[PDB]
């Protein structure tokens, strides 16, 4: 048009501009013949089927006027009216109108129809008819979007059970803590080094650490005895004794303390070992006590 | 002389289902979620928003509920098993299925056993051609 | 079973015997509903927690098939396999598996989990969920059994 600017013509096709001579054409993108003959696009809709070809392709192929017809002449092509580059026709997805037929097999149905293309009403050299069909699945997945939150009169009852963990300690001979003892009693000398370690036979949670809050020896099996020799006092070993060394405590489930043998002063011949232990959570507590060792 | 070139296009039909309140199937819901009680009766129907061909009938091959939106879940409660409703539950009644495009099944609300609070509904459907298939399944209801 | 005698069925539940008609049921000991709803037993283990209810109670309450589930559906109930009267489920005493959580305070830690009971997958009238927890002391007394007899010059 001699009034509208580049917006007057389709954006896809270049808008040529010169003094006293304005027009719009296309580029190498849509310029060739053979691929244009092979060029097309199709759209299968829920209720309609659309087939379109580039109008610039038709113009370049010499088809200034385009006549699009189907098996039924009542169906006729027309401009896209949405994107001006294309020219398209519509066909209802049924059998009987617009010349469409229904091809059905067990898997899923299909609709087939033919499109006739020509430059004019009559055909002189080539009669190109496009055979096209849309396949619609006969089985499909459907999901309800809206979820549900049902209400029920529920009965909730608290149950509480006391539990106890399993804890044991062993007397090892070597500094490597290899062989536990099994006899009910043992004999040793003062110069002998008493290597002892503790273990949890169950509940070896990674975040639960073993911390010796305090340890002591007793002349008798009865823990409640006034004569106590604290080996670990308030999470740390007793000082003034170089022989007291602990390799690990609170690092993991394996808590080991090293000390040499001793004997209570008096008529007490037998010596027992007792300990108190606090399980430490690594999430919050550092579980690595530090003191004036 | 004529040139013929084959063209094919993958398409899909439009299918949707709605949750009605009344036994007459009048008002669909619109909210993303709803709350209900066990005694409440869950009336549901399915419709085709397009392609309402007279000879294509709607047949519920199987329906089931899922605790989550993901259909591929082992915990499935089949409400319709192989084109027929699950027995041992008098509350399961379907007014129409395969007669026309309007397939409706009636059941009362339920809740999955466990920690699952939300329940979803999924279905599979087979379109039936009235020309050849009777499309009126019969079974030991 | 039409082959095994009274030993075939659990001793706790009475074994009924008649010509052409044998079976086993229970007595007034396990027959009522309300106390059965209130009846249960729990066991807190060192590494596992067990909760069980009388199978005869479930049968008498109309729950011919029993579905026991927890906060995590991977955990499922099963027969006791030690005393056939009970039916029980197991849960490791940790946080994360089987839906269990860890409730901790300064005195001592505690593990809590919920048990879901139903006759079938779906629930129609009542949704009874049993909230249970085991308390494990965080401080405990340990004594070495083996005494010592040191030698001195
Ligand atoms: C019912 O009915 C219905 C109807 O509808 C059905 O269904 C259907 O079916 C049909 C048939 O099968 C189909 O079609 C097919 O397809 C396939 C696949 O495809 C592929 O590819 C593509 C591309 O191309 C892709 O993508 C696509 O695309 C499209 C476009 O194109 C679109 O549309 C869509 O969308 C897409 N897809 C989707 C899914 O979406 C796909 O994916 C696929 O992929 C891949 O690819 C590859 C490559 O290509 C492949 O491989 C290759 O292939 C070739 C062909 O292509 C060959 O085969 C070779 O060998 C191979 O290696 C693979 O495989 C795939 N994957 C899978 C499968 O997975 C296809 O494959 C086919 O093809 C065939 O066929 C055709 C026809 O039809 C033919 O063509 C022919 O050719 C010749 C030469 O060769 C000439 O001459 C002529 O002319 C032509 N035409 C006619 C014949 O017509 C071809 O070739 C082939 O054939 C054969 O093959 C063999 C092997 O096996 C050989 O050996 C032989 O040789 C041949 N033949 C001859 C003759 O030669 C077709 O195309 C449809 O699809 C359906 N539908 C649906 C919806 O799907 C049903 O089934 C019924 N039922 C009852 C029961 O009946
Ligand atoms: C960190 O967290 C741990 C959590 O484990 C905590 O340690 C536990 O604390 C609880 C609370 O103290 C302990 O359980 C209390 O035991 C008290 C004394 O023992 C009772 O009860 C035993 C049965 O529970 C019984 O026999 C025991 O039976 C077990 C089998 O079931 C067996 O395994 C065990 O060996 C055996 N022996 C024991 C345990 O020694 C005992 O023989 C003895 O009779 C008991 O008095 C307590 O009852 C009070 O507390 C509970 C809540 O814990 C209340 O329950 C509430 O009741 C309401 C109705 O009244 C109801 O609506 C609520 O739903 C319900 N639940 C709540 C509130 O959570 C009780 O009613 C009662 O509460 C108050 O009592 C006062 C005075 O009597 C009364 O005036 C109030 O009215 C009443 N409250 C209310 C709301 O009415 C518990 O049963 C547990 O034993 C501890 N664990 C261990 C391993 O010992 C730590 O302390 C905690 N630490 C910190 C720092 O926070
Ligand atoms: C095809 O592409 C050509 C681009 O070469 C379009 O116009 C041509 O422009 C060049 C400018 O360098 C001229 O030398 C050519 O003479 C032009 N083509 C002709 C045929 O004169 C052309 O418009 C595009 N479309 C068609 C249908 O040829
Ligand atoms: C509950 O206890 C009764 C005992 O009275 C069990 O069976 C009953 O046996 C008496 C025999 O005097 C019959 O008169 C009753 O008819 C029996 N009960 C029924 C329901 O018929 C009974 O098996 C026990 N358990 C249950 C679940 O009822
Ligand atoms: C341990 O000793 C204390 C006090 O000496 C006493 O009260 C307690 O009964 C004793 N216990 C045993 C088991 O000997
Ligand atoms: C659904 O669950 C299956 C298996 O449980 C899984 O393979 C799939 O990825 C899941 N899909 C979605 C969307 O969650």
Numbering used by the authors:
A (entry chain A): 292 to 584
B (entry chain B): 444 to 584
C (entry chain C): 292 to 444
Paper text:
Here, we report a cryo‐electron microscopy study of uromodulin (UMOD)/Tamm–Horsfall protein, the most abundant protein in human urine and an archetypal ZP module‐containing molecule, in its mature homopolymeric state. Hepsin protease‐mediated cleavage of the CCS leads to dissociation of mature UMOD from the CTP and triggers its incorporation into homopolymeric filaments. These protect against urinary tract infections by binding to uropathogenic E. coli (UPEC), reduce nephrolithiasis, and are involved in the regulation of water/electrolyte balance and kidney innate immunity. UMOD forms a one‐start helix with an unprecedented 180‐degree twist between subunits enfolded by interdomain linkers that have completely reorganized as a result of propeptide dissociation.
D Representative micrograph of UMODe filaments, showing the absence of branches. K Sharpened cryo‐EM map of UMODe (4.0 Å resolution) in two orthogonal views oriented as in panels (D and E). Comparison of this map with that of UMODfl identifies density belonging to the N‐terminal half of UMOD (salmon contour in the front view of panel F), which is lost upon site‐specific cleavage by elastase (orange arrow). E Superposition of the UMODfl (salmon) and UMODe (cyan) cryo‐EM maps shows that only the former shows density for a globular domain protruding from the core of the filaments. This reveals the approximate location of the elastase cleavage site, corresponding to the N‐terminus of UMODe, within the structure of UMODfl (orange arrows).
